[PDB]
Amino acid sequence: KNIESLFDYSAGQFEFIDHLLTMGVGVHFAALIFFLVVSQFVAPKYRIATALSCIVMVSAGLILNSQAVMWTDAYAYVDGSYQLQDLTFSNGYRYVNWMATIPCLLLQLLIVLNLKGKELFSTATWLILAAWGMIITGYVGQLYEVDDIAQLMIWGAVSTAFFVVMNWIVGTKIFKNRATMLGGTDSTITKVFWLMMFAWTLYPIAYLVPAFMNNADGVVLRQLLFTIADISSKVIYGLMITYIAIQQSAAAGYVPAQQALGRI
Numbered sequence: 001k002n003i004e005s006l007f008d009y010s011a012g013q014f015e016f017i018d019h020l021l022t023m024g025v026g027v028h029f030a031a032l033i034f035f036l037v038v039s040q041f042v043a044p045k046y047r048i049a050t051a052l053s054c055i056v057m058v059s060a061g062l063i064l065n066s067q068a069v070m071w072t073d074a075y076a077y078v079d080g081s082y083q084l085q086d087l088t089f090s091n092g093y094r095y096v097n098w099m100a101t102i103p104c105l106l107l108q109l110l111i112v113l114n115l116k117g118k119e120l121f122s123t124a125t126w127l128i129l130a131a132w133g134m135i136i137t138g139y140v141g142q143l144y145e146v147d148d149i150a151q152l153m154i155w156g157a158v159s160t161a162f163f164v165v166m167n168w169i170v171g172t173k174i175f176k177n178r179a180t181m182l183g184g185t186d187s188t189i190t191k192v193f194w195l196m197m198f199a200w201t202l203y204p205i206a207y208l209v210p211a212f213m214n215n216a217d218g219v220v221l222r223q224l225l226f227t228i229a230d231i232s233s234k235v236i237y238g239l240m241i242t243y244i245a246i247q248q249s250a251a252a253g254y255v256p257a258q259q260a261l262g263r264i
């Protein structure tokens, strides 16, 4: 049901996608160790924001690892090209993983925005419901990326509605709570918003690839887009969230944070 299954791949195409996914694994697990060691410099009220980046690194890292092994399982070099065998490859498992990872990305944002208690719980609940609506309708949509492009488009429009409303909640909370933020991170959090708008928008672009480039090179392009998007939305994002967490920790008087920033 996925366009990947439609084509044979050149050694070049096949190896590049393998390398993309493998590099993706390496980057996320390398970052995991960074987030782990810096977590001790985060104040208690923000420390979970950095823990969530650890959780996202392993979750994303595992899905990329799974995709890479699925990729090599599904194809074998036969008569001069990589051809589909008995096992299958699908991006559908990425969608399932987003059900977990996207709530984590959203929660660590709410934490460094200094949201608490009732507002935190209510905002998280609405954000996660919006995200799940987006992910589920998008998942259904890509089931038709071969059989019914029109259906892919309509489910994609519905998904985009959830996406836009989710982003509006995000932007509203960010620009409203920006003033509460310490250590100059009121400025930093603005860049985080735009990083999110940019990186997360790469995913619906990848989703539309079967509509504007239905060939083996389109398959490569989609994995390339996912790689840019994953690294930007999880790793670079997590680094900014953790920076913001440490800076606010220091400004709030957390001594290990102050000491850590002092060494650099």
Ligand SMILES: *C/C=C(C)/C=C/C=C(C)/C=C/C1=C(C)CCCC1(C)C
Binding pocket: 098, 101, 102, 105, 134, 135, 137, 138, 139, 141, 156, 159, 160, 163, 200, 201, 203, 204, 207, 230, 233, 234
């Ligand atoms: C780390 C993974 C992330 C941040 C994934 C984000 C995914 C999206 C923003 C997905 C968006 C979609 C649309 C807005 C329309 C097409 C269907 C989706 C689900 C790909």
Ligand SMILES: CCCCCCCC/C=C\CCCCCCCC(=O)O
Binding pocket: 012, 013, 016, 220, 224, 227, 228, 231, 232
């Ligand atoms: C934050 C950005 C992260 C970027 C991650 C991607 C790094 C590698 C990117 C690709 C370089 C272009 C490779 C050339 C493609 C050759 C075409 C092919 O062989 O199929």
Ligand SMILES: [Cl-]
Binding pocket: 043, 044, 045, 046
């Ligand atoms: Cl604290």
Ligand SMILES: [Cl-]
Binding pocket: 059, 060, 063, 097, 098, 101
């Ligand atoms: Cl993920």
